């Protein structure tokens, strides 16, 4: 997240770390807890890879400080998801852990938008994940960030766009702060967009893709575009 701040425990009782095997572990991915043995996260993170664990009730990384943790025994990509397509296309996927994850201490289930809900625009949100704080960083956050900022219209994300980049589509829901100082970042995709300022708030947005330039991979001059879940919520469910 790039111009946010620390969170407090237990502020995102459903903020999950998505970690990759490889050389050990090393967190890749946000993602959200929907239930026990069910977590939701974006699919660009999972397609292709395999061997994942989702931290739950985790704080500082470096700390593991986890409260719970549990393997991934499987993955659901959206069917319809087109990873090098104009806006990246149906960006969602749920995973079956192997551990139930209990709502207990720090840790609990995400509530989400309905598939009836309003597209929000103008409503006040919170971005959440350990992405970098800075474009042009090397690692990722230590620490749990989040950011106060604003959802937009369809039309208002594609206009505060570059003019080659106008892929923001309605099966989005993106946020932009005026001052352009605000943003996901890498690291930070797969995680939830918290409806609301403060307090308890549905999940409204996966994070998905953002704009970078040759110095800085993510840029908070540009909105931060999630995948609209009330668009695909009868999929999350279902899958």
Same mark, same amino acid.
């Given at each position: 997240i790039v111009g946010g701040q620390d969170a407090t425990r %237990?502020?995102?009782?459903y903020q999950l770390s998505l970690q990759h095997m490889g050389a050990g572990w090393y967190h890749t991915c946000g993602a959200i807890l929907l239930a026990a043995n069910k977590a939701l996260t974006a699919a660009h993170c999972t397609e292709g890879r395999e061997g994942f664990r989702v931290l739950a009730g985790? $704080?500082?990384?470096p700390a593991n400080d986890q409260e719970q943790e549990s393997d991934v025994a499987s993955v659901t990509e $959206?069917?319809?998801? @087109?990873?090098?397509?104009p806006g990246i296309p149906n960006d969602v996927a749920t995973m079956a852990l192997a551990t139930a994850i209990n709502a207990a201490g720090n840790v609990g289930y995400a509530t989400l938008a309905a598939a009836?809900?309003? !597209?929000? =625009?103008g409503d006040q949100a919170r971005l959440s994940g350990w992405?970098?704080? $800075?474009? =042009? !960083?090397?690692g990722i956050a230590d620490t749990l960030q989040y950011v106060v900022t604003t959802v937009r219209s369809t039309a208002d994300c594609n206009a505060r766009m570059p003019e080659h980049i *106008?892929?923001?589509?309605? *099966?989005h829901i993106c946020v932009h702060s005026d001052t352009g100082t605000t943003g996901s970042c890498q690291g !930070? &995709?797969?995680?939830p967009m918290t409806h %609301? =300022? &403060? %307090?308890s708030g549905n999940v409204i947005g996966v994070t998905s893709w953002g704009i970078g330039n040759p110095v800085e991979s993510?840029?908070? @001059?540009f909105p931060s575009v999630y995948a609209r879940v009330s668009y695909f919520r009868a999929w999350i469910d279902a899958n």
């Open positions: %237990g502020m995102f009782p985790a $704080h500082v990384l $959206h069917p319809e998801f @087109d990873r090098f397509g009836n809900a309003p !597209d929000y =625009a992405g970098k704080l $800075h474009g =042009a !960083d090397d *106008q892929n923001v589509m309605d *099966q !930070d &995709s797969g995680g %609301g =300022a &403060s %307090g993510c840029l908070p @001059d």
